[PDB]
Design a protein around this ligand. Structure first.
Ligand SMILES: O=c1c(-c2ccc(O)cc2)coc2cc(O)cc(O)c12
Length: 274
């Protein structure tokens, strides 16, 4: 699919940089015709077929196709797509309260954790209902609308690894951040919606404790820890955490994807259920 090839600078003015990654940079922007504000994600294109640099058209089109499907309060939305010879430029909904990752750098109570968690689960429920696996859930990819309120509202971002799961699983060597990936990702096995639920377990552990359950001193150690389900609830961190909260985590950090809680299970779990 081809995108708008007019110069994006004819329609938008850019400002503060919001984030920067391997082949993408995200800039605050403002649409000239409406005065409305967005985030422009510039994705660097592959310059040749066999290059390892830039993002393949196939990967870019997948992210765009998924984003086009999405409309939910807890997920980023897509406004427009432009492209030129060097970049595809996604004009995305602006979320200006910063990463959940940075908010955490400022442990939560179980109430604070569950208030974030419920919104995350609601967003993931929407996605999984559409058979969309995110595959890169982590605090850096959870953005707050406003960080200076008692109960910040959040939105899931970064669909760069997201896949449609029309057949129950995808077998593609999809692979995110070692701390957050499920054992089936580590082992290069077929992947489905279940991998997201593991990531939610890791996120929940971090929300409650300020500590990462599988983090080793090197990437290979972290990955080895993940595959072995080498984690425990340290008393120093979890002494005043409820057994029900631990139960929620324990039922997500399960090696066999088939035995892992689904998104629907997680919403009905007694720690979450109203
Ligand atoms: O999506 C984002 C955002 C993003 C998008 C929209 C917002 O409103 C806020 C941040 C920021 O940094 C990134 C950095 C990346 O490497 C990849 C991304 O997808 C993003």
């Amino acid at each position: 699919t081809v995108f708008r090839q007019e110069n994006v600078d004819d329609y938008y003015d850019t400002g503060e940089e919001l984030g920067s990654g391997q082949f993408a940079v995200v800039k605050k922007c403002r649409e000239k015709s409406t005065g409305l504000q967005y985030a422009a994600k510039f994705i660097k294109k592959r310059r040749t077929k066999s290059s390892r640099r830039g993002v393949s058209r196939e990967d870019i089109e997948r992210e765009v196709s998924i984003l086009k499907e999405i409309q939910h309060p807890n997920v980023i939305t897509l406004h427009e797509v432009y492209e030129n010879k060097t970049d595809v430029i996604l004009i995305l909904e602006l979320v200006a309260g910063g990463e959940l990752f940075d908010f955490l750098a400022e442990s939560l109570t179980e109430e604070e954790a569950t208030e974030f968690l419920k919104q995350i689960l609601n967003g993931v429920y929407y996605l999984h209902s559409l058979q969309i696996a995110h595959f890169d859930l982590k605090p850096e990819n959870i953005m707050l609308l406003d960080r200076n309120v008692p109960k910040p509202r959040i939105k899931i971002i970064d669909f760069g690894l997201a896949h449609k799961i029309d057949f129950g699983n995808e077998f593609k060597n999809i692979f995110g951040t070692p701390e957050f990936v499920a054992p089936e990702i580590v082992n290069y096995e077929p992947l489905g919606l279940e991998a997201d639920m593991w990531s939610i377990g890791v996120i929940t552990y971090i929300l409650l404790s300020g500590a990462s359950p599988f983090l080793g001193d090197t990437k290979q150690e972290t990955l080895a820890n993940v595959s072995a389900v080498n984690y425990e609830f340290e008393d120093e961190y979890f002494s005043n955490t409820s057994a029900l909260a631990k139960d929620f985590i324990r039922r997500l950090l399960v090696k066999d994807p088939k035995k892992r809680m689904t998104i629907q299970d997680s919403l009905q779990h007694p720690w979450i259920k109203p």
